[PDB]
């Protein structure tokens, strides 16, 4: 099918060349084969930012009409960030079909776009009250919270 | 398949290419990488698909595929 052939292409591309320190791996079915509709991913914090040292786990869930539609990208556990909903779902315009999603966007581009969002929040379109309010009212406390979260999710 | 092509990438953007036997311990690739880059074994750790590569792991055991990427990180030295 259209989704599965594109996702097999994306997997082969990712395995050969991907940004350093990221992870993107399909989950498995009971029979040991890959479930290309549900990927376990991880995004590293950028060096020189308060996110440095963290590795932040995310699930990427594809619908059967992918790549007409973007995947849903959900931090697990939910992330403290102004543009991450309490559910963990990421708000980003490239991840909305009727905003900036384009079918040609690759998994590398999605994960690099989420990485960029981490240290560059969009305060025009907040997704959670807590991280947004702290970002606006108390940047010192915001950075303390971010550095603590990065430590919590640092690889051992 | 007797051999597999692999590349080792670092955060400094380096990319070093290898062609190794599928059933040989990856210790031997790690040792080659250290010789080529002029650094000691205790200074690096190597990951594949987000997991540490043991000296006794082989490409076959790990399910590696032609032209796979392996990541090299600096270890605490420390
Ligand atoms: Na949204």
Task: State in Å: Cα A68 to ligand 1 middle.
Answer: 18
Q: Please, which contacts does B40-44 make with residues 24 or more away whose CB atoms are closer than 8 Å?
A: B42/B75, B42/B77, B43/B74, B43/B75, B43/B77, B44/B72, B44/B73, B44/B74, B44/B75
A6 contact B CB<8A = no
* Residue A150: domain span: 1-156
Contact call for B9 and A20, based on CB within 8 A = yes
Number of domains composing chain A: 1
B5 contact A CB<8A = no
Query: Resolution in A for the shown PDB structure?
Result: 1.4
B75 contact A CB<8A = no
CA distances from A110 to A47, A71, A87, B15, B26 (A): 19, 9, 19, 23, 32
CA distances from A8 to A65, A149, B54 (A): 15, 33, 28
Q: How far is B77 from chain A (nearest CA, A)?
A: 15
CATH of the domain at A52: 3.10.110.10
B1-78 to CATH, choices 3.20.20.100, 3.10.20.90, 3.30.300.340, 3.40.50.1100: 3.10.20.90
b/e per residue A58-74 (b: at least 16 CB within 10 A): bbbebeeebbebbbebb
A42 closest CA partner among B35, B56, B47, B67: B47
Helix (H) or strand (E) holding A35: strand A34-44
Residues A14 and A12: their CA atoms lie apart, in Å, by 6
Contact call for B50 and A42, based on CB within 8 A = yes
Residues in a beta bridge with B17: B7
Structure method = X-ray
């Amino acid at each position: 099918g259209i989704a599965l052939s594109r996702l097999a292409q994306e997997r082969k591309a990712w395995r050969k060349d991907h940004p350093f320190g990221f992870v993107a791996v399909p989950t498995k079915n009971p029979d040991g084969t890959m479930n290309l509709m549900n990927w376990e991913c991880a995004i590293p914090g950028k060096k020189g930012t308060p996110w440095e040292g963290g590795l932040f786990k995310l699930r990427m869930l594809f619908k059967d009409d992918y790549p007409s539609s973007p995947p849903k990208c959900k931090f697990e556990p939910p992330l403290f960030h102004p543009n991450v909903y309490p559910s963990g779902t990421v708000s980003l315009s490239i991840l909305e079909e009727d905003k900036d999603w384009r079918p040609a966007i690759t998994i590398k581009q999605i994960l690099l776009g989420i990485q960029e969002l981490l240290n560059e929040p969009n305060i025009q379109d907040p997704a959670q009250a807590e991280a947004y309010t702290i970002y606006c009212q108390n940047r010192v406390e915001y950075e303390k919270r971010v550095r603590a979260q990065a430590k919590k999710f640092a690889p051992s | 398949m007797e051999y597999i092509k692999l590349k080792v990438i670092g955060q400094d953007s380096s990319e070093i290419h290898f062609k190794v036997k599928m059933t040989t311990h990856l210790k031997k690739l790690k040792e080659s990488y250290c010789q080529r880059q002029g650094v000691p074994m205790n200074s690096l750790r190597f990951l594949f698909e987000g997991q540490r590569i043991a000296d006794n792991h082989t490409p076959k055991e790990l399910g590696m595929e032609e032209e796979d990427v392996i990541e090299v990180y600096q270890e605490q030295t420390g």
